[PDB]
A paper describes a structure:
[name] is a protein expressed in the skeletal and cardiac, or striated, muscle of vertebrates that plays various roles in muscle structure and function. Encoded by the gene [name], [name] spans half a sarcomere (the basic contractile unit of muscle) and has various functions including preventing sarcomere over-extension (Gautel and Djinović-Carugo, 2016), acting as a molecular ruler for thick filament formation and as a hub for numerous signalling molecules (Kruger and Linke, 2011, Linke and Hamdani, 2014). [name] domains are only found in the A-band region of [name], where they are arranged with Ig domains in a pattern termed super-repeats, which themselves are repeated. [name] domains have a characteristic beta sandwich fold, with a core of hydrophobic residues as the “filling” between two beta sheets that pack against each other face-to-face.
Alignment of their primary sequences show an insert in [name]-20 extending the loop connecting strands C'/D to E by five residues that does not align with residues in any other [name] [name] domain. The extended loop in [name]-20 results in a unique protrusion from the back “side” of the domain, not present in the other structures presented here, nor any other [name] [name] domain structurally determined. With this extended loop only present in one further domain ([name]-25), this could be a candidate for a (semi-) unique binding site on a [name] [name] domain for a putative ligand, analogous to the “KTLE loop” in Ig-159 (A169) required for MuRF1 binding to [name]. The variant in [name]-20, Leu18237Pro, was identified in a patient also carrying two C-terminal truncating variants inherited in trans, whilst Val22232Glu in [name]-49 was co-inherited in trans with a truncating variant in the kinase domain at the A-band / M−band junction.
Residue numbers in the entry: 3 to 109
């Protein structure tokens, strides 16, 4: 009924204050269409997971569903996890992304 976990998110772009995060839809949507996703972040120095958007994320980019996470702090290390939403509710989280630091990218 609930959807399965989305794929492990990947950071596709970063700046000092943002990261473009992308993930694949779950293999099992639970039997009803997924209507959107929640994305949460966790930083170094805190155990908590925090939603990064006020409304569900739906944008499909080149590699998966994606969102540019704002309000990151330069030099801080973050991970992200995504949850799918369907008619039954919010599914379990993806595996967390590999850690990434907010900073500008290697040229
Ligand atoms: Cl980089």
């Amino acid at each position: 009924s609930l959807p399965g976990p989305p794929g492990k998110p990947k950071v596709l772009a970063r700046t000092k204050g943002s990261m473009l995060v992308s993930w694949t839809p779950p293999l099992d949507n639970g039997g009803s269409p997924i209507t959107g996703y929640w994305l949460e972040k966790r930083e170094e120095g805190s155990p908590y997971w925090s939603r990064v958007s006020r409304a569900p994320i739906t944008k499909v980019g080149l590699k998966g569903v994606e969102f540019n996470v704002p309000r990151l702090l330069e030099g801080v290390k973050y991970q992200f996890r995504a949850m799918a939403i369907n008619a039954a509710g919010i599914g379990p989280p993806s595996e967390p992304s590999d850690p990434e630091v907010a900073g500008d990218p290697i040229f």
